[PDB]
Design a protein around this ligand. Sequence first.
Ligand SMILES: [Mg+2]
Ligand SMILES: [Mg+2]
Ligand SMILES: [Mg+2]
Ligand SMILES: [Mg+2]
Ligand SMILES: [Mg+2]
Ligand SMILES: [Mg+2]
Ligand SMILES: [Mg+2]
Ligand SMILES: [Mg+2]
Ligand SMILES: [Mg+2]
Ligand SMILES: [Zn+2]
Lengths: 134, 136, 38, 125, 94
Amino acid sequence: YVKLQVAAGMANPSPPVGPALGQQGVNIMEFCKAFNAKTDSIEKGLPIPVVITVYADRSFTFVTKTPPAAVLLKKAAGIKSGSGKPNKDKVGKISRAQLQEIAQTKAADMTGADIEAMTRSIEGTARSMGLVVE
Amino acid sequence: MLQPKRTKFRKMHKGRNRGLAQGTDVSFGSFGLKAVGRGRLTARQIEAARRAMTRAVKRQGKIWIRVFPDKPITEKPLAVRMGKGKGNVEYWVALIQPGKVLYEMDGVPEELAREAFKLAAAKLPIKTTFVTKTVM
Amino acid sequence: MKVRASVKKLCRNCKIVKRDGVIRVICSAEPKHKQRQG
Amino acid sequence: ALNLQDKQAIVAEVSEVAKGALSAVVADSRGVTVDKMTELRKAGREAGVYMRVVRNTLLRRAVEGTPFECLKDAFVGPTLIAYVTEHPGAAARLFKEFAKANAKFEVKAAAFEGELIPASQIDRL
Amino acid sequence: MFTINAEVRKEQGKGASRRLRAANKFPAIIYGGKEAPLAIELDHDKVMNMQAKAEFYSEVLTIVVDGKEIKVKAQDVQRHPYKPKLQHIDFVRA
RNA sequence: AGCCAGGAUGUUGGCUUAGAAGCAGCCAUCAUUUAAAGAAAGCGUAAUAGCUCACUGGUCGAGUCGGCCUGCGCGGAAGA
Ligand SMILES: [Mg+2]
Ligand SMILES: [Mg+2]
Ligand SMILES: [Mg+2]
Ligand SMILES: [Mg+2]
Ligand SMILES: [Mg+2]
Ligand SMILES: [Mg+2]
Ligand SMILES: [Mg+2]
Ligand SMILES: [Mg+2]
Ligand SMILES: [Mg+2]
Ligand SMILES: [Zn+2]
């Protein structure tokens, strides 16, 4: 029962993926290319989280979830890297429509009651990496 | 290390340390280190201490030093008989009577200040306590 | 056994005791915190 | 912690949703993750259900606010109450399937009409 | 509101004062106004815990002396040099 | 105080790094479901995982916490 964050159409380098979930009994290339077959639709350069579920027989089922609050906030403000000094140094900007798009993606991925709760959790990740909401 | 820029006379009578202190109260900072016991503070002591509580506050808030080492102490060196004058001037001291306020402090959290003052007092010869400025 | 005239709690698991008229500091966690007064 | 004023206000909020609520279900909350509990909180805000874990001797003071007083012996043991403010049922049908899904805790005693319902007959709701 | 109970001082001087302070009581005074001064004694503890609030210094308090209140303010107070103690209090008639 | 239970999502917050995922280091430290759950008080990893803590519900059943001021004692305390 492991989790990783893997770039869009990508898999099977040695340090990020193979050892981590490969010491758990998982076949590495089925995860790799069924995850690049599922996440071929995610834009190039966004890490997308993947939850791997392993069973006593090593046959696994993974739910690929929507890209992180921090990655959809990197892309919706246009930027590459967020702030090394958040809310002191501010690195980009998103109007409330992008807070709400990222929070519809994460409306599929949150615990929130309303799209205002998911927009507010994406508001929180918007204040975390320094980005301004405008 | 504190010491009078220039003096009227070079040497002094041993004098006594008697009676109680003036400046019993904290007139600048919110907190102060008061002396309970009676003794002489060399400049070295005061300096080391001021250092201690300067490390302790990470150079924040503010620190006053209310005491000054203005009276010169002498010593004849080893292997020297009595007489032949008064000894040479070794170092400087401040006479301390019970209830003087050695350092004042403010712009800091109280807890932190009690701490810094414990660390400051580790370097001092005499019995000391923590105190707060009051209204009247 | 740090043997000294000022003995203290060096963490949250250190527990002070007086055994046979000696003040010691006993730790479960850290053998290095074992102290006696003297 | 909680001041007496804190406890007083909270007794007023439980008594206030208790007056407004159509039906309630008391259950054991022990031995279940906050993941499945936020799952029954989503399945709660979706069913109109008001979910709570409240102190026992606090809930004797709030339930003295009537007509749930048949539940004051159901407060021995950890207490998680589901008030359905919208619809009756949808708490009692959701809890049996959540406790059979988890196979943890209990779901002990319900209350409707002013009477208490024993554990195997909560299938009435 | 602060109410301080007190007695009239039958004695004076350094000796009286230090016997007062030994007994866990302390001397204070009430002056100001048309009247004559009134020297009184107090319980060290009550007042020490009472001036442990700030308003004590900014406010009109009352002093119960032989059945009779007076309304006063805190004028100045001399404290023992290193000890958590009070040597004396100047009360000015309010 | 003990003992049962949980210590959640966004999320591996961004920075940085071959790796930093609460726990090298730099900066922010928000919001959600909340009974409660620090962008985490320590052990832990190549980095994770793994282990307690803060915090809260349960059982328990009446006093408990730590400063202040003093009285008398303990250690500090070895020599022909
Ligand atoms: Mg003289
Ligand atoms: Mg003078
Ligand atoms: Mg023995
Ligand atoms: Mg006379
Ligand atoms: Mg005399
Ligand atoms: Mg307890
Ligand atoms: Mg008490
Ligand atoms: Mg001895
Ligand atoms: Mg020996
Ligand atoms: Zn220890």
